[model samples]
Target: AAAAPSITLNDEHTMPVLGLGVAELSDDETERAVSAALEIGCRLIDTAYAYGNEAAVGRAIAASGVAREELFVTTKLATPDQGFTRSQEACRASLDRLGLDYVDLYLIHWPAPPVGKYVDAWGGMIQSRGEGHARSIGVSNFTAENIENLIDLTFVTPAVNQIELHPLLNQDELRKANAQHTVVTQSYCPLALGRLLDNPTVTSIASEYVKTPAQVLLRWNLQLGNAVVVRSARPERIASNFDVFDFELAAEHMDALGGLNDGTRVREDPLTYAGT
Candidate 1:
């Protein structure tokens, strides 16, 4: 198996280009899936305080015997924990749950614009970094305007912005904005939550490249320079998902995939999310 590549963040920390995301999985399932992923040379593990599986992720890491330094672990501050003091407390609590002295990255899980405290949350994130509770700090589901607000208020640019992005939601403008600030864009739901697996266009491209639809989708993101987070409890699917490093999609195939975008979203709309 080929080793997954990494991209350096604006803060000079490097993160694996492809990672395992443990969302909505039970503790037993998360531990099993994360263990399988790590065994297959997938070094990055993306989890969150809201996901309620950090301890399971910790158990998987402890049992794997892969040195901690070899892995990139990321978690986020939950919505209810979005205030300045609460955010700081939440980082430590998350670290405790993950049984780690420090996490590779800590993110504000959402902008929670309705709550209107993400800026304060950003302050706590910076405090977590300064105190060495996190190596780097960033945001998820943040729009360009949200990001600019953070920078303007604090003068501390986020190192990464994790978003729900795939061929169906290419997020071109947002991607460009993130780049303009030198923040790396990380893609969650890179497969569109299994919705793209059977698409005629994706399958056609997959067959031409002798790959799976999931592989094609992942490759497209990699080619576009976005880091991706994908999830699967099945070991075979986990291994196959990480096998995408060996191929490249041509310019026309890339264009074809681009054409599939219709601004469709499989998850909550970040802009209108009211902190529920």
Candidate 2:
């Protein structure tokens, strides 16, 4: 297992370049996955209240024997829980569930702009961070517009922006937009849900490096200077995903993957999502 390096957030704190995502696992599964990931040298772990497994993640962390300051854990506030009071209460609840006094990064799960409460929620997150509830604050599935508005409201920029990004949806423009604000771009579905693994271009490059297509795809994000979130329930697969640091992709190979973008998205568009 490669010892992943850390990237400095806009606030000066550091986060792992690669993280184990425990978004949709059962409690038992989350426990096993988190334990295995840490054992394999993973220091970043992501969970969310909507994922309904914070307790499991918390339990795993308590059992890992790793120092609290050594791990970077992230969780999100739910859409229905948007607004100052609700967001504050919700964040406290998530912390309670995680059995953690503070998380490394906390995010607004979705902009949910149509609800008209995200900006209000951002204020609360800012307050929470100032009070030390979370070490840093950011957003997931947010567009550049949403981020701009939030900054306009509070004069605070997010430390990172987590979105559905992959070889098929390179998000060059969105990433550039984030860079303009100094917000780190983090890729969620970096593999395009296994579709890119079978692509001839990815496979051909993988063959040259003698690495799996998944490794090549993940390395693409790393080389692009973006943090990556990878999920797996099996221990071996979790261990394998972190094995990407051994090799680096050449400029041509990197360009080949970047050229595959065609605006494909694996999940709902954040710009108009109104789900409660």
lDDT of 1 by residue, 1-276 (tens): 326989999999999999999999999999999999988899999999888899999999999989988999999988889888999999999999999999999998888788798999998888889999999999999999999999999889999999999999999999999999999999999988899999999999999999999999999998999998986546668988888878899999999999999999998888878553
RMSD of each predicted structure: 1.1, 1.3
Q: Stretches of candidate 2 above 4 Å error?
A: none
Tens digits of per-residue lDDT, candidate 2, 1-276, equal 336999899999999999999977889999999999999889999999989999999999999999999999999988899998889888899999999999999999999877989999999999899989999999998889999999998999999999888989998889999999999998898888888899999999999999998889999988888999996536778767888988889899998998898989987889788673
> Model 2 Cα displacement at 251 (Å)?
1.2
- Model 1's number of clashes is 0
Query: Relative to the true structure, how large is the alpha-carbon lDDT of every model?
Result: 0.91, 0.90
